[PDB]
Amino acid sequence: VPRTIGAELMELVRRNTGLSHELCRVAIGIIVGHIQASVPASSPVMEQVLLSLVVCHDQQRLEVIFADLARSWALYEDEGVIRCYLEELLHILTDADPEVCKKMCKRNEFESVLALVAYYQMEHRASLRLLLLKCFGAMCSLDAAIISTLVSSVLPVELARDMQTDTQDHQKLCYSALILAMVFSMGEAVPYAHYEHLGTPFAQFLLNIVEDGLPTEQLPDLCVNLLLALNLHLPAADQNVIMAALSKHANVKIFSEKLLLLLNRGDDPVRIFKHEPQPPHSVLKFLQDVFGSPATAAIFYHTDMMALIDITVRHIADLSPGDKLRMEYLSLMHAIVRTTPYLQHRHRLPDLQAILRRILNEEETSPQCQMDRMIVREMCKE
């Protein structure tokens, strides 16, 4: 059995059946496997073919598509043609070999990707823009370097501007919000050239969508998650654009409640992909920034304050020692007692004292419990 039977079979079935990568592997496994099963004494070859499983059509098609779309000439053609182009691009980025797509997108210093962005800036046909957004989302699922490239490019700027411009397009608005929530889910780079396009005004816009809404209701929570993605890598207290937007207008109860729910769930809505050096928790960091200053801490009403306190203390007392979340919740409490009148109400405090006493008396030899220990010892201020 040839040492490269696997990739050869994969390529052949791919090109001649139009099947997907995974489904090609599955088909090969089915045929070879059942042949091995039914016809005994055929196992030596079949098992080797199966072991082998563990230029191409897709590569050259990516070459042709990326080259043609970078020619913009695509603005002076029939919408159906470009539609087929972007459809094929999407299908390739979704169903072909991941390594091929990674290799092709990163060619000539991401020339193809950047050309696709520069093209997206000029294309105003909604269908083509939608397809382009989908393709970008497909690229984000490949590698984090492409995310860094896109967040370094002019794409987020054009997305924000398009969002504030074409508000009467719910679908493209949802997808734009999603792509934006994806490119800002890395938290790697901050270009202040985009801050001139995505500042406190854009934050006020998103918050206005969250609070008031548009004339399905699947754009409000996506705007929330977008605010989470944006505030993932912003400043701390006084130089934060979103926190500035919250400082200007603190009459946001719906958003605060949404944050209370998101904190109650515990899960991160911004953590979508699995890349190296994972970023911080969105909701926790957001609430930390909220209680990094009283003015932003005002967004939680008298009721929502006690509620949030209860949920936080609950998470602290429920999280076992060694968890990488308990430290963040303890930090949030330490910020809440420093930004809010916690001593005035003293709600959920008798249990909090027992929680601190139990946490400090933890004989855990772990480093995480140690960090939680120094944090808690710092929080012990009379």
Curated annotation (Swiss-Prot):
Keyword Lipid biosynthesis: no
Domain of life (superkingdom): Eukaryota
An example Gene Ontology CC term for this record: postsynapse
Keywords carried by this UniProt record: Chromosomal rearrangement, Nucleus, Phosphoprotein, Proto-oncogene, SH3 domain, SH3-binding
GO molecular function terms listed in the Swiss-Prot or TrEMBL record: Arp2/3 complex binding; cytoskeletal protein binding; SH3 domain binding
Location of the protein in the cell: Nucleus
Transmembrane segments: none
Tissue: Highest expression in heart, brain, skeletal muscle, kidney and liver. Lower levels in placenta, lung, small intestine and leukocytes. Weak expression in colon, thymus and spleen.
UniProt GO BP: cytoskeleton organization; endocytosis; positive regulation of neuron projection development; regulation of postsynapse assembly
Disease cited in the entry: A chromosomal aberration involving NCKIPSD/AF3p21 is found in therapy-related leukemia. Translocation t(3;11)(p21;q23) with KMT2A/MLL1.
Function of the molecule: Has an important role in stress fiber formation induced by active diaphanous protein homolog 1 (DRF1). Induces microspike formation, in vivo. In vitro, stimulates N-WASP-induced ARP2/3 complex activation in the absence of CDC42. May play an important role in the maintenance of sarcomeres and/or in the assembly of myofibrils into sarcomeres. Implicated in regulation of actin polymerization and cell adhesion. Plays a role in angiogenesis.
Subunit structure: Associates with the intermediate filaments, vimentin and desmin. Binds the first and third SH3 domains of NCK. Binds the proline-rich domains of N-WASP through its SH3 domain. Similarly, binds diaphanous protein homolog 1 (DRF1). Binds the SH3 domains of GRB2 through its proline-rich domains. Interacts with Helicobacter pylori toxin vacA. Isoform 4 interacts with FHOD1. Interacts with FASLG. Interacts with TMIGD2.
Record protein name field: NCK-interacting protein with SH3 domain
